[PDB]
PDB file of C-alpha atoms in Angstrom:
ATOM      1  CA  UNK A   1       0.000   0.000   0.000  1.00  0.00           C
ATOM      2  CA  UNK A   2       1.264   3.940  -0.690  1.00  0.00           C
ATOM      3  CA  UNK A   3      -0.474   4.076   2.744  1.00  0.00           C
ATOM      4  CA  UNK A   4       1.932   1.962   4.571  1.00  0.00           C
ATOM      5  CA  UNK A   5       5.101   2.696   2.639  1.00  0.00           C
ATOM      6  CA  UNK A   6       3.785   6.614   3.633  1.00  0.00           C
ATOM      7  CA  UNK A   7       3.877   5.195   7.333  1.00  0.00           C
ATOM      8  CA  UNK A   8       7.671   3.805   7.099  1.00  0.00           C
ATOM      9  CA  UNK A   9       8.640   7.050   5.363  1.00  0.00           C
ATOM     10  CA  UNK A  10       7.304   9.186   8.524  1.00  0.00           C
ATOM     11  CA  UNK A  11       8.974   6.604  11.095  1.00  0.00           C
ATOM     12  CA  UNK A  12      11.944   6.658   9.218  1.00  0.00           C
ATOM     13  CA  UNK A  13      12.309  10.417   8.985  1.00  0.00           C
ATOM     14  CA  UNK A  14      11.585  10.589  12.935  1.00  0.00           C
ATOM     15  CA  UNK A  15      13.637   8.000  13.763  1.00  0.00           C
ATOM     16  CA  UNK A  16      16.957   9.503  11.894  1.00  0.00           C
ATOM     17  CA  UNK A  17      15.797  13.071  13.437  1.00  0.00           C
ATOM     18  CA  UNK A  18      16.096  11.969  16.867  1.00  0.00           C
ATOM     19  CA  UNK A  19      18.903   9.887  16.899  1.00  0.00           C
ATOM     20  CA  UNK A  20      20.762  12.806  14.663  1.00  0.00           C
ATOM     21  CA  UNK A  21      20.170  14.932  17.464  1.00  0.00           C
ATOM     22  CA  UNK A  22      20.703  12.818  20.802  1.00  0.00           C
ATOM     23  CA  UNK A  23      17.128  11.500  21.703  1.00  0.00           C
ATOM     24  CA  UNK A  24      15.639   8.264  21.668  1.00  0.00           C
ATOM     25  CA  UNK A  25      14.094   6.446  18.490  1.00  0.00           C
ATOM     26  CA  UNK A  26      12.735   3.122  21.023  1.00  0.00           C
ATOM     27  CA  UNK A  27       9.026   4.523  20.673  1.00  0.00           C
ATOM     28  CA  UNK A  28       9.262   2.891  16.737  1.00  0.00           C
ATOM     29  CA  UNK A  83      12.781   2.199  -3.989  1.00  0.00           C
ATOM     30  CA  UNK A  84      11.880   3.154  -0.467  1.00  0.00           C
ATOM     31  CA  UNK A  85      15.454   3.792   0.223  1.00  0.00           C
ATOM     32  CA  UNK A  86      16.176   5.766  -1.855  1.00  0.00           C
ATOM     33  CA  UNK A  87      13.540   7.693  -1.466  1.00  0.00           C
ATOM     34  CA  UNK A  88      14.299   7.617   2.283  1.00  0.00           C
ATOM     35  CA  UNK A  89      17.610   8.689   2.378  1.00  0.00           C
ATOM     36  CA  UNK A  90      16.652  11.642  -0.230  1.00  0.00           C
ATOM     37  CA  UNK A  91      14.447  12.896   2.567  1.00  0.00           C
ATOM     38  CA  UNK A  92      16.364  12.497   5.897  1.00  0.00           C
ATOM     39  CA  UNK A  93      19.299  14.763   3.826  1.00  0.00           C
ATOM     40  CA  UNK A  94      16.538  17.509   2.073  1.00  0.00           C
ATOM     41  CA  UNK A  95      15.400  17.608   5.953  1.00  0.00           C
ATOM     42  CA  UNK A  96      19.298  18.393   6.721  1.00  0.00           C
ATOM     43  CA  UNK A  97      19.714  20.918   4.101  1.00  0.00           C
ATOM     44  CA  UNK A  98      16.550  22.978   4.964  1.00  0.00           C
ATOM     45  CA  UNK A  99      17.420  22.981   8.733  1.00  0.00           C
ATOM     46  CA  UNK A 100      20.842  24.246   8.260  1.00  0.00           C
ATOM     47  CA  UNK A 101      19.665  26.705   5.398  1.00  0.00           C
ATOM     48  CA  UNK A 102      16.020  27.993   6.601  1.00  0.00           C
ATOM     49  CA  UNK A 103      16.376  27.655  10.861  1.00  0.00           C
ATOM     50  CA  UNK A 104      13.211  27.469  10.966  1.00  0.00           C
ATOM     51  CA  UNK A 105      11.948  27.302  14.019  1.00  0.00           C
ATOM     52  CA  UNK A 106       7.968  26.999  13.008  1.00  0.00           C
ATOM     53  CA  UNK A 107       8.029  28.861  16.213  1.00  0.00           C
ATOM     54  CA  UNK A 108       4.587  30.539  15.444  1.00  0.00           C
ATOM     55  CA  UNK A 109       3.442  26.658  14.579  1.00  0.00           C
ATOM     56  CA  UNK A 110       4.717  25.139  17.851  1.00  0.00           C
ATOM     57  CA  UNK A 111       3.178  28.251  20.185  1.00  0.00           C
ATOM     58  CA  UNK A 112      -0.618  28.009  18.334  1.00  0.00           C
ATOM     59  CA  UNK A 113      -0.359  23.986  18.405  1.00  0.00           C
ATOM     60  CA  UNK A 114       1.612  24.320  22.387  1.00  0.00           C
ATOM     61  CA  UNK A 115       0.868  20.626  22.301  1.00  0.00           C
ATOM     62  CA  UNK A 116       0.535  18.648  25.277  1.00  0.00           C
ATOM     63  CA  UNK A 117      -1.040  15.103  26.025  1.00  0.00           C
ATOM     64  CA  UNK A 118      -4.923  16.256  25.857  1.00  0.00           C
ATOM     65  CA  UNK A 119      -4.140  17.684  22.045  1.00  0.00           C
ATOM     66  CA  UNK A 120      -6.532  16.133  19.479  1.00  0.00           C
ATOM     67  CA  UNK A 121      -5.391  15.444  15.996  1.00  0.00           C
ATOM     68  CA  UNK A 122      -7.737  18.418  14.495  1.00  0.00           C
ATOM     69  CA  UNK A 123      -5.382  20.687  16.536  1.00  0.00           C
ATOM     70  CA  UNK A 124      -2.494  19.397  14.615  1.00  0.00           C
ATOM     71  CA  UNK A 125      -3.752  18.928  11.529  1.00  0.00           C
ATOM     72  CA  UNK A 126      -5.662  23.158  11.489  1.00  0.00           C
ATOM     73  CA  UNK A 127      -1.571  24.083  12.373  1.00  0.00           C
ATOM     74  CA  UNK A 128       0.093  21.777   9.916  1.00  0.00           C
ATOM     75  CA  UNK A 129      -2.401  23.632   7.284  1.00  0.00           C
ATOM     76  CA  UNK A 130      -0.963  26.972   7.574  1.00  0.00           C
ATOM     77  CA  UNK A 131       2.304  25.227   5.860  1.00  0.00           C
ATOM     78  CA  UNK A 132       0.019  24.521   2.857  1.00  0.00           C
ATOM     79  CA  UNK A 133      -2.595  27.773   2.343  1.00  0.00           C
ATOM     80  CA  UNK A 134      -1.032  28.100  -1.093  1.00  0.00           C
ATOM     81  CA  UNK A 135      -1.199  24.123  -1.341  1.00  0.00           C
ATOM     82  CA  UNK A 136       1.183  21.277  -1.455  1.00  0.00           C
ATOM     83  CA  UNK A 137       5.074  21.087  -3.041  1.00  0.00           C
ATOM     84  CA  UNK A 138       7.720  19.148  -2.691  1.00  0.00           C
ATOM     85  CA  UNK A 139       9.781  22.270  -0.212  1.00  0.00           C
ATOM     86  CA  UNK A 140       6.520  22.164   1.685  1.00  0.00           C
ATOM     87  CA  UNK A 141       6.491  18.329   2.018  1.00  0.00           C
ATOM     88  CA  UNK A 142      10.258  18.693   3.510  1.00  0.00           C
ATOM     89  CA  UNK A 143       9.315  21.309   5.927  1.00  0.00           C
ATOM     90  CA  UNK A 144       6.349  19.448   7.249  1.00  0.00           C
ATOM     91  CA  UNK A 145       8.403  16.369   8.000  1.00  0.00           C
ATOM     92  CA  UNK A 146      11.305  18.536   9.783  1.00  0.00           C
ATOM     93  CA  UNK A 147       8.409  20.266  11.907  1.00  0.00           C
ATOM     94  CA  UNK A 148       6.814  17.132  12.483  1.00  0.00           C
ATOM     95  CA  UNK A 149      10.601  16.374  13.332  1.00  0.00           C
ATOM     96  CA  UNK A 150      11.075  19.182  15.300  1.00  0.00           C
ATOM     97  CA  UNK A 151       7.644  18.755  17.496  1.00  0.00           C
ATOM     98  CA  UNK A 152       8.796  15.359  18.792  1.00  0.00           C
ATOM     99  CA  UNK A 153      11.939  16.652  19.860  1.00  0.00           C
ATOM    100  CA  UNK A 154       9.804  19.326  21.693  1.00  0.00           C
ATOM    101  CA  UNK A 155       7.507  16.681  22.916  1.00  0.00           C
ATOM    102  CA  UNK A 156      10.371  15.268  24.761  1.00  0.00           C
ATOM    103  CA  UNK A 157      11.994  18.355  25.779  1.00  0.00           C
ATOM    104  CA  UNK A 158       8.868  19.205  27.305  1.00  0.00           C
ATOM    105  CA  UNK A 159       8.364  15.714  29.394  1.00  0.00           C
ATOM    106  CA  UNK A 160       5.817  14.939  27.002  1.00  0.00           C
ATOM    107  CA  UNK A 161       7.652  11.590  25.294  1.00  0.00           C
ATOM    108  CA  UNK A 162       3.939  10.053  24.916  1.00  0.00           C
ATOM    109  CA  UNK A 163       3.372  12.060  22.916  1.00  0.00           C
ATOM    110  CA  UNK A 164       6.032  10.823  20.269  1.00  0.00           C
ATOM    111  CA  UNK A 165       4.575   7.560  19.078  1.00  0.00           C
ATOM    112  CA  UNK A 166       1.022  10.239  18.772  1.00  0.00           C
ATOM    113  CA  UNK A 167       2.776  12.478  16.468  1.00  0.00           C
ATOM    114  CA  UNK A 168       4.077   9.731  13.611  1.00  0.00           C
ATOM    115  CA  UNK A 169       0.242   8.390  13.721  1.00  0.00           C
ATOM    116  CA  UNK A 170      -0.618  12.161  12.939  1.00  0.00           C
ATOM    117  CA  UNK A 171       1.877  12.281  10.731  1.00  0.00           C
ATOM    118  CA  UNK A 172       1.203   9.382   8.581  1.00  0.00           C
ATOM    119  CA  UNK A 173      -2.399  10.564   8.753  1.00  0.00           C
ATOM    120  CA  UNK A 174      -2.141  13.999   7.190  1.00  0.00           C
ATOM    121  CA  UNK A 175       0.110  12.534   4.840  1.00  0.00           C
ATOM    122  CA  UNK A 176      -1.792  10.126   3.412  1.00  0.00           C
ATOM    123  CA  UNK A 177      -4.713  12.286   3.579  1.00  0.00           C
ATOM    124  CA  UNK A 178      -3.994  15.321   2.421  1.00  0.00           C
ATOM    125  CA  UNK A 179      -0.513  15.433   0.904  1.00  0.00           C
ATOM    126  CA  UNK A 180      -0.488  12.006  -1.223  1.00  0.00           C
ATOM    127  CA  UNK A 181      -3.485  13.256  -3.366  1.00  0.00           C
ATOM    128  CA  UNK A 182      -0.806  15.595  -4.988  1.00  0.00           C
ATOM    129  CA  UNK A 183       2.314  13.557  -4.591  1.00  0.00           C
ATOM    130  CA  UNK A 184       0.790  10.973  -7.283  1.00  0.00           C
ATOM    131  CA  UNK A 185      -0.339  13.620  -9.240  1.00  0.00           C
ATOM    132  CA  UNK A 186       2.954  15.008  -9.596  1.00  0.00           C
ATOM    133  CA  UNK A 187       4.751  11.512 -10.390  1.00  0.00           C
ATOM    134  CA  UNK A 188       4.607  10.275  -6.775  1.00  0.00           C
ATOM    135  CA  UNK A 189       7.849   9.675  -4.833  1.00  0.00           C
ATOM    136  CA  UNK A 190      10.241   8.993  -7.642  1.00  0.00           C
ATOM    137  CA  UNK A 191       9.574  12.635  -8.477  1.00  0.00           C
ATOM    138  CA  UNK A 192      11.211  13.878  -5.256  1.00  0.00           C
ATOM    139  CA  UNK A 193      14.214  11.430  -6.134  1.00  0.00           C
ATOM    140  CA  UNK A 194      14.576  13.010  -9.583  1.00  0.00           C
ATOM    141  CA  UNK A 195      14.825  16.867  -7.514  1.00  0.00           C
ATOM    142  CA  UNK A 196      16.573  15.594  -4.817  1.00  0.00           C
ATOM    143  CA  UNK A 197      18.900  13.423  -5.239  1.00  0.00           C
TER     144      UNK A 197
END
């Protein structure tokens, strides 16, 4: 299924996000496709430094946040609608809330945000991924 694979791709991404940066991952061609993303996630961190700090402090998650919550925030990222820069920076801020999460003594919450993740993916992001050649496509930008 593009619905699983979509799954892998957000546990993957997480994973390498918080072992690149000293946290724990124990809460969790594809590769290819994998590794383009964990280093487009790199480059727009060390070029952007985005914080998504206006994101984080209108989400402020916490354990009692419902998915709507997320998914209204994750939005603002697409009001112009979906590309392949805006795919990247919605993994690294999905990235960047788990890192929070912990940071925060939240680690539940974790596991929460790759469900969410995969979710909003698969919802509304993949409708315009396979319209626009599907994940080979990002390869063929990316690298």
């Amino acid at each position: 299924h593009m619905s699983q694979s979509n799954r892998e791709l957000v546990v993957d991404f997480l994973s390498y996000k918080l072992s690149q940066k000293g946290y724990s991952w124990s809460q969790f061609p594809m590769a290819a496709v994998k590794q383009a993303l964990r280093e487009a996630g790199d480059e727009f961190e060390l070029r952007a430094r985005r914080a998504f700090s206006d994101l984080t402090s209108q989400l402020h998650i916490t354990p009692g946040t419902a998915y709507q919550s997320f998914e209204q925030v994750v939005n603002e990222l697409f009001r112009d609608g979906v590309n392949w820069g805006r795919i990247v920076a919605f993994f690294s801020f999905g990235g960047a809330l788990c890192v929070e999460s912990v940071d925060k003594e939240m680690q539940v919450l974790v596991s929460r945000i790759a469900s969410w993740m995969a979710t909003y993916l698969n919802d509304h992001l993949e409708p315009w991924i396979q319209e626009n050649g599907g994940w080979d496509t990002f390869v063929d930008l990316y690298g």
